Symmetry: D2
Subunit: 337 residues, 4 copies
């Protein structure tokens, strides 16, 4: 396979089946079904169309299973999945209520909202692993923290420090990232709902009320459309790379102590090297999300699709990093003399 994260043998090291499952084609489609179901309900609530048409959409979509091969044919034909997805959804809905699915929405609305739904779940997992890792590393520090370490500054031995002193440079930044992530998670996962040209012209003056209701139903933040405003995507990408960056410092430290040999015992430091790799991977990948801030006019295919290529691997690198760092810390049997 192209990426080691999903590779049938290399995933023994780089694997993260829990985070990767959220970027599966099935998970995307489920979240896209969620968008369309909630949209129909929000539009009934605002009396755009009748209640019995929205319930026909809900029940029609409740047991909706997609034809994957035909969805691929869709993106081969159109460039984007949603017109063929919507076609399949209308085929599942009884009566004239099928003409009402996807009303007022555009392709970017359903794709970006699905992304935000799944990024939200990925961030919950990442925070949980972050808090557990902070505890594990804290246990490494409370076990061996009093023991002397030879300090090292600029590749030379320096004065003696302790294990607690060195550990604080691993743990304290991780605590900051947890807090950064928790603050982000409060309103950073936003509904994408702006219509063909970002103006919601099919909804007129009901635009604001439908948007509010749809956001609440999906558990997402109500914000005006951000079809070309991608600063929250780059902000989340920054955080991802901040976490890998700190864990790569941890990995670089452990590998150096391993090479010196006198001041650790491990149960060769492959996990430590893997942390550095992932740090440097995310530090490269951050550039692509920042290049994608320049998204011209109302919708930019060039800028938008660079995020498709690069973001899922950034959140996987961060999750893998947390797994591998947990595996490394269990290998550490003593720090210090």
């Amino acid at each position: 396979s192209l990426s080691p994260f999903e590779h049938p043998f290399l995933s023994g090291l780089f694997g993260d089946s829990e985070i990767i499952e959220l970027f599966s084609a099935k998970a995307d489609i489920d979240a896209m079904i969620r968008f369309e179901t909630a949209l129909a309900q929000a539009e009934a609530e605002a009396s755009i169309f009748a209640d019995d048409e929205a319930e026909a959409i809900v029940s029609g979509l409740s047991e909706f299973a997609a034809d994957m091969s035909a969805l691929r044919h869709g993106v081969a034909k159109d460039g984007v999945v949603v017109p063929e997805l919507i076609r399949q959804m209308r085929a599942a809905v009884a009566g004239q209520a099928a003409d009402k699915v996807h009303f007022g929405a555009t392709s970017q609305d359903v794709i970006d909202t699905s992304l935000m739904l799944r990024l939200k779940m990925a961030a919950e997992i990442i925070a949980t692993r972050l808090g557990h890792l902070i505890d594990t590393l804290g246990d490494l520090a409370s076990r061996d923290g009093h023991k002397p370490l030879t300090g090292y500054t600029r590749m030379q031995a320096a004065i003696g420090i302790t294990v607690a002193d060195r550990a604080a440079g691993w743990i304290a930044p991780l605590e900051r990232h947890l807090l950064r992530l928790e603050t982000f998670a409060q309103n950073g996962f936003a509904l994408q709902f702006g219509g063909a040209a970002g103006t919601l012209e099919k909804l007129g003056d009901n635009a604001g009320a439908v948007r509010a209701d749809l956001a609440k139903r999906l558990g997402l933040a109500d914000r005006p459309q951000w079809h070309n405003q991608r600063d929250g995507i780059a902000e989340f990408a920054n955080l991802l790379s901040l976490v890998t960056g700190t864990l790569g410092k941890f990995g670089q430290d452990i590998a150096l102590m391993a090479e010196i040999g006198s001041e650790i015992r491990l149960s060769n430091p492959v996990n430590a090297e893997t942390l550095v790799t992932l740090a440097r991977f995310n530090a490269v990948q951050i550039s692509a999300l920042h290049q994608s801030l320049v998204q011209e006019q109302e919708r930019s295919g060039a800028g938008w699709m660079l995020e498709w290529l690069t973001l899922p691997q950034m959140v996987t690198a961060t999750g893998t990093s947390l797994l591998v760092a947990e595996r490394l810390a269990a290998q550490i049997d003593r720090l210090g003399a």
Copy 2:
């Protein structure tokens, strides 16, 4: 010169003297002088030495003049300015109080603290310019905001929208970046005071008291040393590129609108200022990668990672600064938006 920001002619387009002068050798030395002065005062305040010894350091540093040839020679020999700087400062201090300048501090303490003092200054300028530009762009939208525009999605004409619809994509992210900056500036400019191996071993139990007073005197946040913790710098650099990125979207829009030619009127006759915004966006989008690579800063101190930040960050704050200058210039050229 190497950079267009400082170039004798390319600065007609790329220059920002107000921001760039925060990265002058002189401005750096002044901030290092302030560090060493306040360190002396902080240590007398924590009863480490008496008031008259700190006062000998304070008055000696007030009329201290650094020798620049010598300082350059010092970084050739040592890699770092402060040993030679401290050597010179001691010569400006009379008596045995000269032995006490720089007590408890290491070179990364004075270099990073100086950087934070001056990045704080630059952040105040950038915040103010962001605020002004938000208003300017708001005035563009109030003048022509109900006027029709041809929407354009994925390089094809879409349905009609208004000028205020398109302008919200310029204005709204900038308003978020203003708020991001203000939040960062709350406690993000921190004192660097850790000593030789990050443990402030010279001060003992008085390390917390000295650090607290030193941070106060310099107007920086009191936080444990971050010699190898560079997340605040990567976070700050992220915001720098967030601003240029949005402004490059704005510039790209204007340039496309200029090329079509039917729904914009630019004065001066073309869209060089618009292209420049795009260039600067792509510049910082590249440079952000450098500060993220420097997150891996091994052991108690890492020359390799730390010096990458020296090569890259000042031009990132300059690009953000220049972008705000260029965005304001471009907006002043815009006579009409819409039909």
Copy 3:
């Protein structure tokens, strides 16, 4: 799926099954078998063990199939496939000849050689596609090349030009990249054969002759080991990015001409935008391979795994770009007034 290149629906746009199948675990395993097959033969040739010892290896590995799941657990245990892969290869070989597989080799030898064998295959497909695309764009220019076009310099209508004038900016760099790729392919795909610490300490005086024979059998260049010398990889990735870059310039022009709409007929320009995307993708990933030039000591796991993460998608991006560009050119019905 993390990458739209392999995605069950996004591959309708980004797919390239021919190039992607070169990075499958099966193709890797088959390449690694070839390394170990030809290694035994080269060592028999230099009289290190008997001919029938080598022949038992050749035929035992001819019908070798890997236990993929056990290989996954091998990389979890060891950090790298090869110890496990070798253990299974030994069970497939009859007699005392089983001890002779992998003699004189290290894990990086078999992995980097496998890479090089399959990258040579990828570069062949990419050069064949490049030549064919140059014909196609040449056919566009011999149909419409006489027609006038509005020149555009720095986002402003400039003076008139012709279609041949503009098309030369598409064709000429591609012709240079073809020659570039052809020149690299001469001796740029090299054998990796250095043993534990790069010295081939198992072979003594027979090192030079074994390596030469092994390189010749595999169709690879005989160079001294390059375990920590990754400039040829970065050089190759540069080339990969050079191709997508030019095709991104092509895409950007087509997308711009489509927006204006008066001097092109297509048959909305998703393909033109996709090329711009893949250009900016490869212009980011090139950074990873250059960060990987810093590879410490005799083997750097941190620098080497960054290539694992990033290079397969660079060759796929280049390959997909050529596919998409061939599709985009086939949509162009008219250029000019």
Copy 4:
């Protein structure tokens, strides 16, 4: 100043005045005079205007001093120096002859040719420094090469190697970089001469002849205009980073050996750490030149000006790297146990 390369005290470590003075406003201007002097000579040779007017331009620009302030107002008015520069040049040339300076040329013609003229000079300096350092590292190798070293693979002590073995990983790629540079320098520094939209409209059938003559006179390659074809610039930039990447590998090895301390003597390995810094700097900047490959239409101010911002510092980082490595090499008094 913004960059340590030029900084009043930081240039103690990062300075390279010989390379940096090739990117001074003066060296730029002098190269643009050279373009314009040779332009008039080439055009009088092809009989586009009289010889007296050609030698009025040559002699007019012999003692040309630029009003620098005015040139800066010129880039604030036009975006580029040349319109104000060409205006100053017609004030230096007597008669009506002054109507002919810049005839048939555009802004990007003189700017990119100036660049090419000075990168050619930078590359000569870099090649010389590279050969000298190959010899210097070779002398370190021939002094201590037989002495035992502890091998380290994947941050762990491996079997014993010798000094000569490890030194080959520093020397052999640099010998390949030297040949790469010599191969590039033969035809890679080209004249830019395309006119307003790449078609040399003012020239007519004299186009090819004037371009051949101008390139000969300036000691650059005759190639067709590459206003929007920046592959030679990304190619050259790749080379620059290959050189710093290898020196960064050398630098990281020395830093690690100093930290262990048992197997070297240095007469605090700051130079070794600086080489890593310069490798990672260039490994980041290579991305900008590859992003600048997408250059839309006949001229792209956006992509072109990103080269302006990033390429001079890439050539300076390579230049400085070779200076720092040569300083580090002289500090090495012993390699080996």
